Amino acid sequence: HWGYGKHNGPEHWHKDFPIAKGERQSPVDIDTHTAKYDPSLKPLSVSYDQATSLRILNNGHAFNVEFDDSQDKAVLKGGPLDGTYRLIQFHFHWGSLDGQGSEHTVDKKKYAAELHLVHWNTKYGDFGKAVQQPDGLAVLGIFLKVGSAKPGLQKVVDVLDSIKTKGKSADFTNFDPRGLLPESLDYWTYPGSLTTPPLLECVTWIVLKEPISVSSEQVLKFRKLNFNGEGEPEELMVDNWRPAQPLKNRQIKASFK
Ligand SMILES: COC(=O)/C=C/C(=O)N[C@@H](Cc1ccc(O)c(Cl)c1)C(=O)O
Ligand SMILES: [Zn+2]
């Protein structure tokens, strides 16, 4: 199936998923000097105090930390959003080297990694229904640069040994995603898509201006994971990012000057 190798990577996705070449695909390059400051953009509301993490899973493309989304416990509101969006899962994209790994780019700059906190619009009842709507998902994207260690990330790093191969999962309760946020909630926003197949065009992207710093030792542990399942030949899980797609008929708004 689809992946990030020479023969099944993003260049090939359009064959099974023709929407790959569609009107609002993600990620994109964020040209900071073309983004329009929009003073009518309300502040982002991130309410994660009652967040309930359940499990961590290696799905063969990345690892997902999954949350109980059966109630309004961890939600995104405000900013460009109408209504309430519940946190369902977060995961990362990263590189084989510190100089690549992010999906979005800022003035063509690639970051070492990118975090995606995925939320769905409660008005649609469940994640599966939400992805069929143009405003079904809100994804908060955070860049990672390599520098000082992120303490709130270490609990994630430590459990990776236990989910090394595709299909492995582990218990992962009492994790607080607030430890993954930068100081500022200043952001860019644009209409886009899932960055993995089926690449559905259902996402309001909210990309934070300020990256978080993680240590080289922390990202190094991401790179020890495997794309392959247990017993299969070993392919390191690295460079699991889709490159920037054409902006086309879209505008990027900024919450700040
Ligand atoms: C930007 O974030 C994303 O691209 C998030 C992608 C994502 O959450 N994908 C799912 C799989 C999935 C399951 C049911 C469905 O109807 C579809 Cl369309 C996908 C996953 O990784 O578990
Ligand atoms: Zn992602």
Provide DSSP, 77-117: EETT--S-EEEEEEEEEE-SSTT---SSEETTBPPSEEEEE
Q: Which two tokens stand for residue 67?
A: 């949350």
Burial 154-183 (b: 16+ CB within 10 A, else e): bbbbebbeebbbbebbeebeebebeebbee
Q: Which of 29, 61, 75 is nearest to 245 (CA)?
A: 29
The amino acid occupying position 203 is: V
Q: Which two tokens stand for residue 8?
A: 């099944």
Cβ-proximal residues to 211 (8 Å cutoff; 6+ apart), any chain: 111, 142, 143, 144, 145, 182
From CA 75, how far away is CA 86, in angstroms rounded? 4
| Ligand 1 pocket residue status of 194, Cβ below 6 Å | yes
Question: What number of residues does the chain have?
Answer: 257
Q: What angle do CA 152, 150, 65 make, to 5 degrees?
A: 45
Experimental method: X-ray
In the DSSP assignment, the letter for residue 160 is G
Q: Tell me which residue has its CA closest to atom 14 in ligand 1.
A: 128
The active-site residue out of 14, 61, 104, 119 is 61
Whether the CB-CB separation of 198 and 22 falls below 8 Å is answered with no
C-alpha distances in Å from residue 158, one per residue of 9, 93, 117, 136, 166: 29, 18, 20, 33, 17
- Report which bound ligand comes closest to the CA of 2: 1
| Ligand 1 pocket residue status of 202, Cβ below 6 Å | no
User: Which helix (H) or strand (E) element contains residue 130?
Assistant: helix 127-130
Q: Which two tokens stand for residue 177?
A: 């995603």
Q: Provide φ and ψ at 215, rounded to 5°.
A: -85, 160
| DSSP percent split of the chain into helix, strand, coil, nearest 5 | 15, 30, 55
From CA 123, how far away is CA 126, in angstroms rounded? 9
Torsion of CA 157, 160, 166, 167, to 10 degrees: -110
- CA of 236 relative to ligand 1 center, distance in Å: 22
C-alpha distances in Å from residue 246, one per residue of 25, 109, 191: 7, 16, 13
Kind of pairing between the strands at 253-254 and 36-37: parallel
The answer to whether 93 is a known ligand-binding residue is: yes
From CA 17, how far away is CA 126, in angstroms rounded? 23
From CA 28, how far away is CA 251, in angstroms rounded? 11
CA-based end-to-end distance of the chain = 43
Ligand 1 pocket mutation pick from 69, 131, 139, 204 by most atoms within 8 angstroms of CB: 131
Whether the CB-CB separation of 52 and 43 falls below 8 Å is answered with no
Instruction: Report the nearest atom of ligand 1 relative to the CA of 89.
Output: 8
Q: Which two tokens stand for residue 212?
A: 């978080």
From CA 158, how far away is CA 33, in angstroms rounded? 39
Q: Number of helices and strands (H, E) in the chain?
A: 3, 15
Is residue 61 part of the annotated active site? The answer reads yes
CA-based max dimension of the chain: 55
User: Which helix (H) or strand (E) element contains residue 156?
Assistant: helix 154-159
Whether the CB-CB separation of 219 and 205 falls below 8 Å is answered with no
Whether the CB-CB separation of 53 and 172 falls below 8 Å is answered with yes
| Ligand 1 pocket residue status of 242, Cβ below 6 Å | no
Whether the CB-CB separation of 202 and 192 falls below 8 Å is answered with no
Provide DSSP, 196-237: STT--S-EEEEEESSPEEE-HHHHHHHTT-BSSBTTSPP-B-
From CA 164, how far away is CA 141, in angstroms rounded? 24
Whether the CB-CB separation of 146 and 214 falls below 8 Å is answered with yes
Q: Which of 204, 188, 185 is nearest to 26 (CA)?
A: 204
Domains recognised in the chain with CATH numbers: 1-257 (3.10.200.10)
Ligand 1 pocket mutation pick from 24, 69, 118 by most atoms within 8 angstroms of CB: 118
